[PDB]
Structure formats: structure tokens, C-alpha cells
Amino acid sequence: STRPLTLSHGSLEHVLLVPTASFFIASQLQEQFNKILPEPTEGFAADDEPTTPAELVGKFLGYVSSLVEPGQFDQVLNLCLTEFENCYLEGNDIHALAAKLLQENDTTLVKTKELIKNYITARIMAKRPFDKKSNSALFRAVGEGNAQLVAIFGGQGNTDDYFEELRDLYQTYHVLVGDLIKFSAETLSELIRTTLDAEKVFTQGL
């Protein structure tokens, strides 16, 4: 059996059906989550507060992932992961859900990025990587011969604040590109050290 509970944030709230076996673990995690979640506001126009139930579930998911560390809360993590997927990710990619939330609902781009971050980090933390190949319409079309893809890479001049893009790509997808970025930093530092006059150019370091 599975007694239910309601992860709620003021006006907006969502109901979860946890198994009876781990109901107490779920309830303690829920109480902690209400403890770390700020009071609701009219219009939810402020930050750090969900605006739609999808956002609330994703925030709970990220909180559990923060406590989850590869056993205690693992089972509830998986259970609520599956509930969120089955209710909000109708066999569609998380990015599709984020785009839906932006376009139709009145959610900020930052909140959608945070939801993506929570869901993806939880998916990796729950031993549910994305090893299974996707069925994205575009790549299906390419395989069927319907479409042809060419990849292009830009360069200097596009923007004055590119490091912000690097920052966002690090923050949201930390669990996917952390190794890449760390290897990049390490090899860059090694090249600086081995290169004769690099440090002369790199006055403030790299």
C-alpha cells in the first residue's frame, strides 16, 4: 500500500503517493523541505519560490539529491523521480518541459534552468543515467534520411560576456560537464606552467 502526502508551497501544492514502508522517511524529508522553503507570495513573482507544481516537485527532487549521497533517502528519491517523470515528463525530454513552462506558464527562465538542474542532477544521482538512446524527432528523421545535419561553431565577437555562458553551463550541467571543465582547467594550467612566457601574459592567472 501507499499512504499519500502533499508537498505544498502556499497556494500551489502537489500530492505524492509514497509507499507505506518509507512513509516516515518521506515525511521527515518533506518537513525538512518545508523548513528550507520560503513563505509563498502573491503572484509568486519573487525568487526562491516555485510558481507551478512542476517547479515544486523539481525543488523537492533537488533537495533530496543534496541529501542523497552515493542510501537512506535513495528509495524516496527514485519514487518521487518516477512520479515527477510520469506526471510532468509525458515521455518527453526535460528541456521540452522547461520550454513548455516558459512559453505557457508564467515562469522565469532562471526557475526553468533550476528545474532542469534539479531533475538532471537527481537522475544522475539515482543511478539512472541517460545511457538509453533518445527518440528525439530530429535525430530519428536524420536516421531515416529525412534530414541532414551540419554543426557550426562560432568564435570571437559574438558577445562581450561569454564567461557568463560558461558559468551557466557549469552550474546547470555540473554533473555532465564537470569532468570536462576540470580537465580543461588542469591542462590549461599545465600549458601555462610549461610555456615560457604564458604567466607574463596571464597577469591575473587562469
PDB file of C-alpha atoms in Angstrom:
ATOM      1  CA  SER A   1       0.000   0.000   0.000  1.00  0.00           C
ATOM      2  CA  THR A   2       0.977   3.669  -0.237  1.00  0.00           C
ATOM      3  CA  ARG A   3      -0.328   6.418   2.026  1.00  0.00           C
ATOM      4  CA  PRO A   4      -0.314   9.844   0.321  1.00  0.00           C
ATOM      5  CA  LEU A   5       1.294  13.151   1.241  1.00  0.00           C
ATOM      6  CA  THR A   6       1.247  16.677  -0.181  1.00  0.00           C
ATOM      7  CA  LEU A   7       4.411  18.588  -0.992  1.00  0.00           C
ATOM      8  CA  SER A   8       2.830  22.039  -0.843  1.00  0.00           C
ATOM      9  CA  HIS A   9       4.012  25.617  -1.349  1.00  0.00           C
ATOM     10  CA  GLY A  10       1.286  28.035  -0.315  1.00  0.00           C
ATOM     11  CA  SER A  11      -1.409  28.319  -2.965  1.00  0.00           C
ATOM     12  CA  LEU A  12       0.192  25.808  -5.339  1.00  0.00           C
ATOM     13  CA  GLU A  13       0.661  22.289  -3.992  1.00  0.00           C
ATOM     14  CA  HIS A  14       1.232  18.761  -5.267  1.00  0.00           C
ATOM     15  CA  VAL A  15       0.207  15.356  -3.909  1.00  0.00           C
ATOM     16  CA  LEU A  16       2.570  12.378  -3.773  1.00  0.00           C
ATOM     17  CA  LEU A  17       1.622   8.749  -3.105  1.00  0.00           C
ATOM     18  CA  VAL A  18       4.557   7.288  -1.170  1.00  0.00           C
ATOM     19  CA  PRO A  19       4.587   3.586  -0.211  1.00  0.00           C
ATOM     20  CA  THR A  20       3.637   2.923   3.391  1.00  0.00           C
ATOM     21  CA  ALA A  21       7.032   1.304   4.025  1.00  0.00           C
ATOM     22  CA  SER A  22       9.028   4.547   3.698  1.00  0.00           C
ATOM     23  CA  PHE A  23       6.260   6.961   4.684  1.00  0.00           C
ATOM     24  CA  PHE A  24       8.190   8.183   7.723  1.00  0.00           C
ATOM     25  CA  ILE A  25      11.357   8.837   5.710  1.00  0.00           C
ATOM     26  CA  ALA A  26       9.275  10.692   3.133  1.00  0.00           C
ATOM     27  CA  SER A  27       7.516  12.701   5.848  1.00  0.00           C
ATOM     28  CA  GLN A  28      10.732  13.758   7.577  1.00  0.00           C
ATOM     29  CA  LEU A  29      12.233  14.799   4.246  1.00  0.00           C
ATOM     30  CA  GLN A  30       9.016  16.677   3.495  1.00  0.00           C
ATOM     31  CA  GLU A  31       9.190  18.546   6.800  1.00  0.00           C
ATOM     32  CA  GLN A  32      12.811  19.481   6.150  1.00  0.00           C
ATOM     33  CA  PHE A  33      11.758  20.671   2.688  1.00  0.00           C
ATOM     34  CA  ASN A  34       9.029  22.922   4.092  1.00  0.00           C
ATOM     35  CA  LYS A  35      11.638  24.152   6.560  1.00  0.00           C
ATOM     36  CA  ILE A  36      14.020  25.218   3.776  1.00  0.00           C
ATOM     37  CA  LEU A  37      11.243  26.578   1.514  1.00  0.00           C
ATOM     38  CA  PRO A  38      10.301  30.285   1.889  1.00  0.00           C
ATOM     39  CA  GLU A  39       6.816  31.638   2.503  1.00  0.00           C
ATOM     40  CA  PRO A  40       4.607  31.896  -0.576  1.00  0.00           C
ATOM     41  CA  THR A  41       3.857  35.287  -2.104  1.00  0.00           C
ATOM     42  CA  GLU A  42       1.069  36.688  -4.233  1.00  0.00           C
ATOM     43  CA  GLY A  43       1.795  36.036  -7.891  1.00  0.00           C
ATOM     44  CA  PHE A  44       4.945  34.083  -6.917  1.00  0.00           C
ATOM     45  CA  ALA A  45       6.806  36.810  -8.805  1.00  0.00           C
ATOM     46  CA  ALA A  46       9.696  36.562  -6.321  1.00  0.00           C
ATOM     47  CA  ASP A  47      12.702  34.231  -6.447  1.00  0.00           C
ATOM     48  CA  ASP A  48      13.414  31.058  -4.469  1.00  0.00           C
ATOM     49  CA  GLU A  49       9.704  30.142  -4.596  1.00  0.00           C
ATOM     50  CA  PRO A  50       8.112  27.807  -7.169  1.00  0.00           C
ATOM     51  CA  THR A  51       5.360  29.125  -9.407  1.00  0.00           C
ATOM     52  CA  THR A  52       3.971  25.805 -10.687  1.00  0.00           C
ATOM     53  CA  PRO A  53       3.714  22.305  -9.195  1.00  0.00           C
ATOM     54  CA  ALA A  54       6.407  21.055 -11.584  1.00  0.00           C
ATOM     55  CA  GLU A  55       8.822  23.564 -10.063  1.00  0.00           C
ATOM     56  CA  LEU A  56       7.910  22.450  -6.536  1.00  0.00           C
ATOM     57  CA  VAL A  57       8.447  18.777  -7.333  1.00  0.00           C
ATOM     58  CA  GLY A  58      11.765  19.568  -9.001  1.00  0.00           C
ATOM     59  CA  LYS A  59      12.872  21.586  -5.981  1.00  0.00           C
ATOM     60  CA  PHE A  60      11.995  18.723  -3.645  1.00  0.00           C
ATOM     61  CA  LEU A  61      13.898  16.452  -6.005  1.00  0.00           C
ATOM     62  CA  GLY A  62      16.996  18.635  -5.856  1.00  0.00           C
ATOM     63  CA  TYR A  63      16.761  18.837  -2.081  1.00  0.00           C
ATOM     64  CA  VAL A  64      16.619  15.045  -1.791  1.00  0.00           C
ATOM     65  CA  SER A  65      19.544  14.786  -4.209  1.00  0.00           C
ATOM     66  CA  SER A  66      21.526  17.150  -1.978  1.00  0.00           C
ATOM     67  CA  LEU A  67      20.895  14.796   0.944  1.00  0.00           C
ATOM     68  CA  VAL A  68      21.304  11.740  -1.290  1.00  0.00           C
ATOM     69  CA  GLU A  69      24.953  10.724  -1.473  1.00  0.00           C
ATOM     70  CA  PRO A  70      26.193   7.591  -3.301  1.00  0.00           C
ATOM     71  CA  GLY A  71      21.314   5.026   0.775  1.00  0.00           C
ATOM     72  CA  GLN A  72      18.861   6.396   3.319  1.00  0.00           C
ATOM     73  CA  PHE A  73      16.752   8.621   1.056  1.00  0.00           C
ATOM     74  CA  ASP A  74      17.585   6.796  -2.185  1.00  0.00           C
ATOM     75  CA  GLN A  75      14.294   4.912  -2.450  1.00  0.00           C
ATOM     76  CA  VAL A  76      12.165   8.016  -1.925  1.00  0.00           C
ATOM     77  CA  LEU A  77      14.414   9.838  -4.387  1.00  0.00           C
ATOM     78  CA  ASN A  78      13.621   7.226  -7.034  1.00  0.00           C
ATOM     79  CA  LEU A  79       9.919   7.153  -6.146  1.00  0.00           C
ATOM     80  CA  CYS A  80       9.439  10.906  -6.463  1.00  0.00           C
ATOM     81  CA  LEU A  81      11.700  10.940  -9.531  1.00  0.00           C
ATOM     82  CA  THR A  82       9.328   8.490 -11.191  1.00  0.00           C
ATOM     83  CA  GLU A  83       6.223  10.368 -10.049  1.00  0.00           C
ATOM     84  CA  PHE A  84       7.575  13.661 -11.417  1.00  0.00           C
ATOM     85  CA  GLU A  85       8.532  11.996 -14.700  1.00  0.00           C
ATOM     86  CA  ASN A  86       5.175  10.273 -15.144  1.00  0.00           C
ATOM     87  CA  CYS A  87       3.071  13.323 -14.318  1.00  0.00           C
ATOM     88  CA  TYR A  88       5.107  16.119 -15.928  1.00  0.00           C
ATOM     89  CA  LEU A  89       7.508  14.402 -18.376  1.00  0.00           C
ATOM     90  CA  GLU A  90       4.992  12.632 -20.596  1.00  0.00           C
ATOM     91  CA  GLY A  91       7.633  10.610 -22.410  1.00  0.00           C
ATOM     92  CA  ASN A  92       9.370  13.858 -23.346  1.00  0.00           C
ATOM     93  CA  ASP A  93      12.740  15.419 -22.605  1.00  0.00           C
ATOM     94  CA  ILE A  94      13.218  17.687 -19.599  1.00  0.00           C
ATOM     95  CA  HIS A  95      14.103  20.554 -21.935  1.00  0.00           C
ATOM     96  CA  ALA A  96      10.695  20.189 -23.578  1.00  0.00           C
ATOM     97  CA  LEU A  97       9.086  20.568 -20.148  1.00  0.00           C
ATOM     98  CA  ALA A  98      11.192  23.638 -19.365  1.00  0.00           C
ATOM     99  CA  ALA A  99      10.263  25.209 -22.697  1.00  0.00           C
ATOM    100  CA  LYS A 100       6.594  24.467 -22.004  1.00  0.00           C
ATOM    101  CA  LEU A 101       6.830  26.080 -18.575  1.00  0.00           C
ATOM    102  CA  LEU A 102       8.440  29.188 -20.059  1.00  0.00           C
ATOM    103  CA  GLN A 103       6.086  29.573 -23.015  1.00  0.00           C
ATOM    104  CA  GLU A 104       2.717  28.793 -21.442  1.00  0.00           C
ATOM    105  CA  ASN A 105       3.114  29.237 -17.689  1.00  0.00           C
ATOM    106  CA  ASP A 106       4.489  32.442 -16.162  1.00  0.00           C
ATOM    107  CA  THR A 107       7.834  31.011 -15.075  1.00  0.00           C
ATOM    108  CA  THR A 108      11.161  32.831 -15.231  1.00  0.00           C
ATOM    109  CA  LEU A 109      13.998  31.477 -17.344  1.00  0.00           C
ATOM    110  CA  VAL A 110      16.110  31.165 -14.190  1.00  0.00           C
ATOM    111  CA  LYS A 111      13.490  28.995 -12.496  1.00  0.00           C
ATOM    112  CA  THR A 112      13.311  26.721 -15.544  1.00  0.00           C
ATOM    113  CA  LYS A 113      17.096  26.362 -15.572  1.00  0.00           C
ATOM    114  CA  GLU A 114      16.961  25.496 -11.870  1.00  0.00           C
ATOM    115  CA  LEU A 115      14.307  22.855 -12.550  1.00  0.00           C
ATOM    116  CA  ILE A 116      16.468  21.359 -15.303  1.00  0.00           C
ATOM    117  CA  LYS A 117      19.435  21.340 -12.931  1.00  0.00           C
ATOM    118  CA  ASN A 118      17.484  19.627 -10.158  1.00  0.00           C
ATOM    119  CA  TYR A 119      15.998  16.964 -12.417  1.00  0.00           C
ATOM    120  CA  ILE A 120      19.234  16.139 -14.233  1.00  0.00           C
ATOM    121  CA  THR A 121      21.390  16.045 -11.104  1.00  0.00           C
ATOM    122  CA  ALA A 122      18.804  13.813  -9.427  1.00  0.00           C
ATOM    123  CA  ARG A 123      18.663  11.491 -12.437  1.00  0.00           C
ATOM    124  CA  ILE A 124      22.421  11.041 -12.302  1.00  0.00           C
ATOM    125  CA  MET A 125      22.474  10.708  -8.508  1.00  0.00           C
ATOM    126  CA  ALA A 126      19.794   7.985  -8.622  1.00  0.00           C
ATOM    127  CA  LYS A 127      21.889   5.621 -10.792  1.00  0.00           C
ATOM    128  CA  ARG A 128      19.570   6.386 -13.724  1.00  0.00           C
ATOM    129  CA  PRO A 129      21.926   7.876 -16.318  1.00  0.00           C
ATOM    130  CA  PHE A 130      20.832   8.679 -19.854  1.00  0.00           C
ATOM    131  CA  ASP A 131      22.562   5.624 -21.327  1.00  0.00           C
ATOM    132  CA  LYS A 132      19.392   4.604 -23.169  1.00  0.00           C
ATOM    133  CA  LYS A 133      19.327   6.346 -26.538  1.00  0.00           C
ATOM    134  CA  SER A 134      16.721   9.054 -27.020  1.00  0.00           C
ATOM    135  CA  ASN A 135      13.977   9.057 -29.644  1.00  0.00           C
ATOM    136  CA  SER A 136      14.171  12.762 -30.451  1.00  0.00           C
ATOM    137  CA  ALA A 137      12.217  13.535 -33.605  1.00  0.00           C
ATOM    138  CA  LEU A 138      15.164  15.336 -35.210  1.00  0.00           C
ATOM    139  CA  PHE A 139      17.672  12.501 -34.903  1.00  0.00           C
ATOM    140  CA  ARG A 140      15.036   9.940 -35.871  1.00  0.00           C
ATOM    141  CA  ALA A 141      14.458  11.956 -39.039  1.00  0.00           C
ATOM    142  CA  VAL A 142      18.201  12.097 -39.690  1.00  0.00           C
ATOM    143  CA  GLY A 143      18.494   8.336 -39.303  1.00  0.00           C
ATOM    144  CA  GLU A 144      15.536   7.769 -41.625  1.00  0.00           C
ATOM    145  CA  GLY A 145      17.187  10.031 -44.220  1.00  0.00           C
ATOM    146  CA  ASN A 146      14.553  12.751 -43.857  1.00  0.00           C
ATOM    147  CA  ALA A 147      17.025  15.353 -42.536  1.00  0.00           C
ATOM    148  CA  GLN A 148      20.683  16.351 -42.885  1.00  0.00           C
ATOM    149  CA  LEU A 149      22.638  17.914 -40.020  1.00  0.00           C
ATOM    150  CA  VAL A 150      25.720  20.143 -40.149  1.00  0.00           C
ATOM    151  CA  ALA A 151      27.318  21.531 -36.986  1.00  0.00           C
ATOM    152  CA  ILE A 152      28.821  25.027 -36.899  1.00  0.00           C
ATOM    153  CA  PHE A 153      30.959  26.626 -34.190  1.00  0.00           C
ATOM    154  CA  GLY A 154      31.260  30.367 -33.663  1.00  0.00           C
ATOM    155  CA  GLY A 155      34.183  32.379 -32.381  1.00  0.00           C
ATOM    156  CA  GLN A 156      35.153  35.805 -31.098  1.00  0.00           C
ATOM    157  CA  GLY A 157      32.901  38.835 -31.388  1.00  0.00           C
ATOM    158  CA  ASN A 158      29.517  37.238 -30.730  1.00  0.00           C
ATOM    159  CA  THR A 159      29.184  38.643 -27.205  1.00  0.00           C
ATOM    160  CA  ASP A 160      31.080  40.585 -24.559  1.00  0.00           C
ATOM    161  CA  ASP A 161      30.162  38.359 -21.608  1.00  0.00           C
ATOM    162  CA  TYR A 162      30.814  34.785 -22.763  1.00  0.00           C
ATOM    163  CA  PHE A 163      32.165  33.747 -19.373  1.00  0.00           C
ATOM    164  CA  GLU A 164      28.569  34.051 -18.166  1.00  0.00           C
ATOM    165  CA  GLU A 165      27.610  31.348 -20.647  1.00  0.00           C
ATOM    166  CA  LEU A 166      30.454  29.215 -19.318  1.00  0.00           C
ATOM    167  CA  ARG A 167      29.201  29.874 -15.781  1.00  0.00           C
ATOM    168  CA  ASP A 168      25.646  28.791 -16.585  1.00  0.00           C
ATOM    169  CA  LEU A 169      26.853  25.712 -18.453  1.00  0.00           C
ATOM    170  CA  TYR A 170      28.900  24.838 -15.362  1.00  0.00           C
ATOM    171  CA  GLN A 171      26.122  25.472 -12.836  1.00  0.00           C
ATOM    172  CA  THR A 172      23.154  23.826 -14.551  1.00  0.00           C
ATOM    173  CA  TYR A 173      25.013  20.868 -16.093  1.00  0.00           C
ATOM    174  CA  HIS A 174      27.669  20.477 -13.397  1.00  0.00           C
ATOM    175  CA  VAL A 175      27.043  16.729 -13.314  1.00  0.00           C
ATOM    176  CA  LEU A 176      27.525  16.402 -17.102  1.00  0.00           C
ATOM    177  CA  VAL A 177      30.435  18.732 -17.879  1.00  0.00           C
ATOM    178  CA  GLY A 178      32.255  18.958 -14.548  1.00  0.00           C
ATOM    179  CA  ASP A 179      34.919  16.482 -15.625  1.00  0.00           C
ATOM    180  CA  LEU A 180      35.310  18.227 -18.980  1.00  0.00           C
ATOM    181  CA  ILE A 181      35.774  21.651 -17.398  1.00  0.00           C
ATOM    182  CA  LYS A 182      38.110  20.347 -14.691  1.00  0.00           C
ATOM    183  CA  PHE A 183      40.281  18.600 -17.277  1.00  0.00           C
ATOM    184  CA  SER A 184      40.292  21.830 -19.298  1.00  0.00           C
ATOM    185  CA  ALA A 185      41.451  23.872 -16.308  1.00  0.00           C
ATOM    186  CA  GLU A 186      44.143  21.344 -15.397  1.00  0.00           C
ATOM    187  CA  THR A 187      45.563  21.135 -18.918  1.00  0.00           C
ATOM    188  CA  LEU A 188      45.418  24.930 -19.279  1.00  0.00           C
ATOM    189  CA  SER A 189      47.369  25.386 -16.043  1.00  0.00           C
ATOM    190  CA  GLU A 190      49.919  22.796 -17.152  1.00  0.00           C
ATOM    191  CA  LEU A 191      50.332  24.551 -20.512  1.00  0.00           C
ATOM    192  CA  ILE A 192      50.782  27.876 -18.721  1.00  0.00           C
ATOM    193  CA  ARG A 193      53.446  26.417 -16.447  1.00  0.00           C
ATOM    194  CA  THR A 194      55.302  24.679 -19.284  1.00  0.00           C
ATOM    195  CA  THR A 195      55.036  27.595 -21.727  1.00  0.00           C
ATOM    196  CA  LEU A 196      57.898  30.065 -21.428  1.00  0.00           C
ATOM    197  CA  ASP A 197      56.099  33.414 -21.154  1.00  0.00           C
ATOM    198  CA  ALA A 198      52.488  32.378 -20.527  1.00  0.00           C
ATOM    199  CA  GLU A 199      52.362  33.700 -16.961  1.00  0.00           C
ATOM    200  CA  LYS A 200      53.670  37.022 -18.275  1.00  0.00           C
ATOM    201  CA  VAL A 201      50.540  37.302 -20.407  1.00  0.00           C
ATOM    202  CA  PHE A 202      48.272  35.751 -17.753  1.00  0.00           C
ATOM    203  CA  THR A 203      48.760  38.552 -15.248  1.00  0.00           C
ATOM    204  CA  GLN A 204      45.715  37.579 -13.163  1.00  0.00           C
ATOM    205  CA  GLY A 205      46.037  33.810 -13.625  1.00  0.00           C
ATOM    206  CA  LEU A 206      43.813  31.225 -15.280  1.00  0.00           C
TER     207      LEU A 206
END
